[PDB]
Design an enzyme around this catalytic site. Sequence first.
Site, PDB file in Angstrom:
ATOM      1  N   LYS A 109      -6.802   7.558 -12.239  1.00 49.17           N
ATOM      2  CA  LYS A 109      -5.417   7.858 -12.575  1.00 49.17           C
ATOM      3  C   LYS A 109      -4.646   6.587 -12.920  1.00 49.17           C
ATOM      4  O   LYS A 109      -3.733   6.611 -13.748  1.00 49.17           O
ATOM      5  CB  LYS A 109      -4.732   8.579 -11.412  1.00 49.17           C
ATOM      6  CG  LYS A 109      -5.402   9.882 -11.006  1.00 49.17           C
ATOM      7  CD  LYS A 109      -4.507  10.686 -10.075  1.00 49.17           C
ATOM      8  CE  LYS A 109      -5.223  11.909  -9.535  1.00 49.17           C
ATOM      9  NZ  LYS A 109      -6.316  11.549  -8.592  1.00 49.17           N
TER      10      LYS A 109
ATOM     11  N   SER B 206      10.258  -2.709  14.971  1.00 50.71           N
ATOM     12  CA  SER B 206      10.583  -3.574  13.847  1.00 50.71           C
ATOM     13  C   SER B 206      11.438  -4.767  14.257  1.00 50.71           C
ATOM     14  O   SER B 206      11.418  -5.807  13.601  1.00 50.71           O
ATOM     15  CB  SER B 206      11.334  -2.778  12.783  1.00 50.71           C
ATOM     16  OG  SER B 206      12.591  -2.379  13.284  1.00 50.71           O
TER      17      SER B 206
HETATM   18 MG   LIG Z   1      11.898   1.447  15.840  1.00 54.69          MG
END
Ligand SMILES: [Mg+2]
Length: 324
Positions: free
Chosen positions: A61, A166
């Site tokens: 693709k 994070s």
């Molecule tokens: Mg988090």
Amino acid sequence: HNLHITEKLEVLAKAYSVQGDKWRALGYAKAINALKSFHKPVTSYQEACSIPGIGKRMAEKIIEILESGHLRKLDHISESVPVLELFSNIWGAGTKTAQMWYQQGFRSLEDIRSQASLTTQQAIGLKHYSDFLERMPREEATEIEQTVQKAAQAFNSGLLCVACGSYRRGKATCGDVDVLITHPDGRSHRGIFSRLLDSLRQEGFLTDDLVSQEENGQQQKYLGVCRLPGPGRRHRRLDIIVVPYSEFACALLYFTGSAHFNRSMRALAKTKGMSLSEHALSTAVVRNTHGAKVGPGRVLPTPTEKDVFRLLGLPYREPAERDW
DNA sequence: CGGCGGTACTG
DNA sequence: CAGTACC
DNA sequence: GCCG
Ligand SMILES: [Mg+2]
Ligand code: NA
Ligand code: NA
């Protein structure tokens, strides 16, 4: 490099995800993470296949696009995907519920609000639909951690509070706040939740609860909603896990992520006849032909993240080198 | 053929 | 149990 | 979807 091609695959990846085709969507998941980790972009049906993670069909693709700018799949994507993504973006609602609502003729949040049968969690998610989609600058994430850590040491100076996810990985923004609370004396962390919860509830800091089994003193986690005082403040998602000092390392590693990191990492121990979890790292784990754990094993001691990498024959990697 | 991570609440 | 969630 |  971030090729306009991968930018066309994610369009599919998310499609198969919301549609509940987890595995296929997973296939497009790593094939994209590869093309995104490419030093300098390729343009050959072969050189691509070579790249790990990219299979035969994938490249088939890639050509079409690069080559063309066209992708057959993209045009035949059901006009249901966007609505499924809309619905699936409600906390507490997943692909299963999303397809159910759509099947019932639901097409918007308006329709969901008036006619949909919602769980208490989904009612909260819908209430903060937009809030749960924004990220907060880490500076504010700090203020929230600080806020919990203050209420924690408020009754036990020994309580160690940290912000993972994070945040600990060094990102500028954060989707939520993941706080880990433990205790060096390996016991003082017992049955404390309600104390803190009732504390943060006193400050009017907590606004809503999503997951919190407090009628059982064995509660391990808390997922809820909070909001700092003053104007311009928005509601933010707050996760909290209290683990014994004995599993602190593994907990810290788990809570730091990223998600793809733990999966890939746990997949490694899996091969080495080992098993890793937010609780501990085990060895001599007994599993059947279907990869199912038939017999537990020995919980190797791991007082530091390094020990885990070490035991797994892996070189330590800073929280920032985990953002993958 | 068949796994693709290991785990914690909710109802 | 299935669904969904945490990383 | 990929890959063993
Ligand atoms: Mg988090
Ligand atoms: Na959701
Ligand atoms: Na979280």
